[PDB]
Structure formats: structure tokens, C-alpha cells
Amino acid sequence: NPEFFLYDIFLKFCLKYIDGEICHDLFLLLGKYNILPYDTSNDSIYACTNIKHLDFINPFGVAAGFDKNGVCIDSILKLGFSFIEIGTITPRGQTGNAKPRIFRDVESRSIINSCGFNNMGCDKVTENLILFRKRQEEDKLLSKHIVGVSIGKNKDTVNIVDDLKYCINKIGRYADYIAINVSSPNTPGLRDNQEAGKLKNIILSVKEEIDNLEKNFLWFNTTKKKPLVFVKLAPDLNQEQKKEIADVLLETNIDGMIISNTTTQINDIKSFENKKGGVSGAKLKDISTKFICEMYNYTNKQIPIIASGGIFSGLDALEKIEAGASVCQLYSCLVFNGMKSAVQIKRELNHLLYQRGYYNLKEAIGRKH
Ligand SMILES: Cc1cc2nc3c(=O)[nH]c(=O)nc-3n(C[C@H](O)[C@H](O)[C@H](O)COP(=O)(O)O)c2cc1C
Ligand SMILES: Cn1nc2c(=O)n(C3CC3)ncc2c1[C@](N)(c1ccc(C(F)(F)F)c(Cl)c1)C1CC1
Numbered sequence: 430n431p432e433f434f435l436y437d438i439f440l441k442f443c444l445k446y447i448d449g450e451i452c453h454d455l456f457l458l459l460g461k462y463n464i465l466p467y468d469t470s471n472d473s474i475y476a477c478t479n480i481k482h483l484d485f486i487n488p489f490g491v492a493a494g495f496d497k498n499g500v501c502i503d504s505i506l507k508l509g510f511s512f513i514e515i516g517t518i519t520p521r522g523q524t525g526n527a528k529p530r531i532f533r534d535v536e537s538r539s540i541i542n543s544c545g546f547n548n549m550g551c552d553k554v555t556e557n558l559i560l561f562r563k564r565q566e567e568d569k570l571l572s573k574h575i576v577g578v579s580i581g582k583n584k585d586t587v588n589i590v591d592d593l594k595y596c597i598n599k600i601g602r603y604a605d606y607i608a609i610n611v612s613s614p615n616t617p618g619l620r621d622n623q624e625a626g627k628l629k630n631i632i633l634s635v636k637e638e639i640d641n642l643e644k645n646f647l648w649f650n651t652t653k654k655k656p657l658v659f660v661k662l663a664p665d666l667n668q669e670q671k672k673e674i675a676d677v678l679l680e681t682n683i684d685g686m687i688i689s690n691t692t693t694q695i696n697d698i699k700s701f702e703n704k705k706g707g708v709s710g711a712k713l714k715d716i717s718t719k720f721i722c723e724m725y726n727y728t729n730k731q732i733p734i735i736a737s738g739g740i741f742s743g744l745d746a747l748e749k750i751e752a753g754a755s756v757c758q759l760y761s762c763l764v765f766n767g768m769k770s771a772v773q774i775k776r777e778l779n780h781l782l783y784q785r786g787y788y789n790l791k792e793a794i795g796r797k798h
């Protein structure tokens with residue numbers, strides 16, 4: 430498309446001279462005024478995918494933390510993504526940790542960030558999403574797109590479940606699915622909530638609040654159904670903990686599990702030495718894919734997987750799919766490849782299934798095993 434490629438020229442300049450968050454702000458500003466490129470081409474019906482009754486028109490979305498406030502949904506989706514996960518949001522607004530809090534190593538295609546759940550808050554983001562859903566009702570290019578909401582807790586909150594209830598009660602009826610973020614490394618003490626008991630109570634409380642929205646049309650979202658419940662897991666756990674978690678998720682009946690968030694155990698990027706925050710990008714790819722393989726077995730194939738971590742190429746995506754993933758989220762690939770990310774990776778993925786003899790994307794899930 431003539432429009433996508435023009436932004437590629439500025440991409441290398443930005444990654445070299447401009448601060449990361451200015452780049453983020455500009456991208457949100459471009460999309461706010463609908464001057465970002467569009468991809469209105471039909472997607473391969475053999476590349477479509479689904480999680481339960483959620484039907485994704487293609488297997489690529491944008492991971493949480495990119496449009497943390499839902500102010501740029503239309504333009505991002507129209508870049509060629511099937512869905513976007515907004516958030517992570519909290520009940521009360523937060524400015525996050527001090528800036529600068531985002532750093533990029535172009536050579537390794539890696540990012541380290543210490544944002545700290547900066548967001549307008551549930552109320553304002555809820556307003557933004559309500560505005561999007563109204564625009565969705567009048568734009569054909571948005572009728573089949575999916576919007577999930579990642580929810581979290583304020584830094585000063587003590588109990589996580591209390592904050593999760595507020596988000597569900599206010600933005601729950603506008604979300605196609607809810608992602609439980611208990612894996613951020615930039616808010617103290619959160620990852621400790623991944624212990625089985627606490628995670629079990631979290632999932633039941635989140636699933637209880639969603640089911641209770643009906644009791645007290647209701648679903649002003651894409652599906653017209655109640656939102657599914659997903660959990661995003663951190664990769665820095667030992668094997669016994671992963672086993673407990675798998676047992677919890679299945680027992681609690683989780684609709685899916687995102688794998689994964691950022692990691693804190695990587696220490697071989699020279700420009701990131703002595704910096705706080707979680708690391709994203711290519712270096713996280715192989716680590717995350719194994720977390721899927723492990724969890725996919727621990728779950729006995731009964732819990733769908735959503736892949737997030739170092740996905741840059743169509744083959745990187747098929748590695749995630751064949752490992753057990755049903756859909757993929759991008760974040761760093763967007764940062765380092767830009768407006769063309771979705772078009773390039775969708776074209777590459779279609780080329781791949783053709784050579785490998787697959788009938789459709791569904792045939793590839795877990796074929797690695
Ligand atoms: C600057 C930055 C901010 C992020 N913010 C969030 C967030 O708010 N909530 C969340 O669940 N994940 C967040 N993430 C993690 C991403 O969603 C994703 O898991 C990570 O970037 C790895 O994917 P990638 O290798 O394709 O970049 C953030 C990542 C980065 C780099
Ligand atoms: C270079 N870039 N850096 C980013 C970054 O650091 N983030 C934050 C989350 C961590 N998000 C997006 C970042 C981009 C981005 N590739 C970009 C920004 C601005 C321009 C320009 F030239 F129009 F101004 C261009 Cl062409 C491309 C954006 C499209 C995904």
C-alpha cells in the first residue's frame with residue numbers, strides 16, 4: 430500500500446534520535462486524527478482463528494500496554510490487526526514511574542520498560558471505549574474487530590480482587606474479553622499473586638463479577654456476549670509453580686492464558702545494564718515459546734494459548750502456533766517494523782502454511798508436539 434511504506438522511512442530516524450515515549454505519543458496522535466495507513470484487504474479465510482466463541486478474522490493483534498487508555502483503537506485496528514488489548518488499566522489513574530521509563534536496543538530488537546501501570550483510570554478509559562463502540566456501530570472496517578481489556582491494580586492498592594471488581598463493573602459490558610494481568614514486574618508484589626491459592630481466588634472473583642453483570646441490550650461489544658476471562662502469566666517462575674497455576678486455571682475454568690509478559694532475568698544487553706523494568710522483543714522469543722510448550726502440556730491442551738513475546742516474522746508466529754498457540758499479539762514488532770507490521774507478518778504467515786501443506790491455521794495448533 431502506498432501509505433504504509435512512507436512511514437518506514439521515518440522509522441529508522443525515530444529509533445535512532447527520538448525518545449521512545451515521544452514515538453509512542455506521536456503514534457497515538459497520528460491514529461487519533463485518522464492519518465495512519467489502512468489495510469482494507471481481505472484476510473485469508475484459512476488464517477482465521479478462534480478462542481471458544483471469539484472469532485478472530487486473523488491471528489495478529491496488538492498486546493496490552495500500547496494503547497493503555499483506548500484513545501487510538503480505530504486507527505491501530507485499521508493497520509491490519511484483528512484485535513487489540515487495551516490497558517492494563519487500574520481503577521484510579523496513575524502517572525507511572527518517573528521518565529525516562531522506556532529504552533530500546535535497535536540492534537537486538539529489544540525493549541526494556543518500567544512504565545508502572547500509567548493510565549487515565551477505569552472511568553476515563555471506559556468513556557473512551559464507549560466512544561469507540563459507538564464509532565464501531567457506524568464503520569464497516571470495525572464491525573468484526575475484537576477489543577479486550579487488560580485489568581490491573583493501583584500501586585497503592587492492597588487487595589487485587591477489589592480493584593478487579595471495579596474494572597469489571599464499569600468496563601466489563603463493553604469488553605469482548607478480560608485479561609487478568611498478574612505478571613507485571615513494575616508494580617511491587619504483583620507477581621507474588623501468581624501463587625495458586627491467590628490466583629485461584631482472583632480468577633473465581635473475576636469470573637464471578639462477570640457472571641453477575643447479567644443478574645443485576647447488556648453487552649455493548651462486538652460479540653453481544655459476556656466477556657471471556659484470560660490470565661497473562663509471567664515467565665520467571667519455577668516448574669512446580671507452573672504446575673500449580675495450570676491446575677488452578679483449568680479448575681477455575683479460564684477461557685485462555687496469555688504467554689507471556691516481560692522478563693527480568695535477561696542481563697546480556699549492554700545498553701540495558703543496571704536498568705529496572707521488564708525486557709521485551711526478540712531475546713524473549715525462544716524463552717516464551719517454551720513457556721507455551723510447558724504450560725500447553727501442563728494444561729493438557731484444555732486451555733487455549735495466546736502468544737506474546739518476540740514475534741517479528743511469520744515463522745516466529747508459526748513457531749508460537751505450532752507450539753500450541755491459537756492467536757498472537759505483537760508489541761515490539763510494531764515498534765521496530767512500524768506501520769507495516771501487520772501486513773508484512775500476515776503475508777509471511779500465509780506464505781508459510783502454503784509451503785507446509787496446512788489446510789488452515791487451525792491445523793497447525795500444537796503440531797510441533
Ligand atoms: C513499553 C512497554 C509497555 C508495556 N505495558 C504493558 C502493560 O501495560 N500491560 C501488559 O499486560 N503488558 C505490557 N507490556 C508487555 C507487552 O504486552 C508484551 O508482552 C511485550 O512487549 C513482549 O512482546 P514483544 O516481544 O512482541 O514486544 C509492555 C511492554 C512494553 C515494552
Ligand atoms: C519508532 N517507534 N518507537 C516506538 C516506541 O518506543 N513505542 C513504545 C511502546 C514502547 N511504541 C511505538 C514506537 C515506534 C513506531 N514504530 C513509530 C513511531 C513514530 C513514527 C513517526 F515517524 F511517524 F513519527 C514512526 Cl514512522 C513509527 C510506532 C508505530 C509503532
Ligand SMILES: O=c1cc(C(O)O)[nH]c(=O)[nH]1
Nearest residue numbers: 544545546613615691707
Ligand atoms: O505487564 C506489564 C506492565 C508494565 C508497566 O506498566 O510497566 N510493563 C511491562 O513490560 N509489562
